[PDB]
């Protein structure tokens, strides 16, 4: 059985690679969710900072409109 032997070897080869590949995709995905988690924490900070700035410019400007 020559052909049968060859087909079975490509199926084994595909299935070994496909399996390792899937482990690699999992860690890629878990990487993504970690990055979003972190970037989430950054955006809450920028937001606080930008809102704090917004006020402190307006506060300064009220000093300027007097003089």
């Amino acid at each position: 059985n020559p052909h049968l032997r060859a087909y079975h070897q490509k199926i084994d080869s595909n299935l070994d690679e496909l399996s390792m590949g899937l482990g690699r995709l999992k860690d890629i995905a878990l990487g993504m969710q970690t990055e979003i988690e972190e970037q989430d924490d950054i955006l809450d900070r920028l937001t606080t900072k930008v809102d704090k700035l917004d006020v402190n410019i307006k506060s300064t400007e009220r000093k300027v409109r007097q003089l």
Binding site: L25, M32, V50, L53, I57, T60, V64
Partner: protein, 61 residues
């Protein structure tokens, strides 16, 4: 037989689809990221010029 391969191949298609949908959204957000970066950068030249003119003012008098 070759139908449970056919389901594996389907799952891999839907996964591939999920990965594309994810990059499309990550892409579609560069727009928001860069506008954010712009406004703050624009705001910065104003504070600079504002402080600068507040120096011109404090000297000129």
């Amino acid at each position: 037989a070759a139908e449970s391969w056919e389901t594996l191949e389907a799952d891999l298609i839907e996964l591939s689809q999920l990965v594309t949908d994810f990059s499309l959204l990550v892409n579609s957000q560069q727009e928001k990221i860069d506008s954010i970066a712009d406004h703050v950068n624009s705001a910065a030249v104003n504070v600079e010029e504002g402080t600068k003119n507040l120096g011109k003012a404090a000297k000129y008098k």
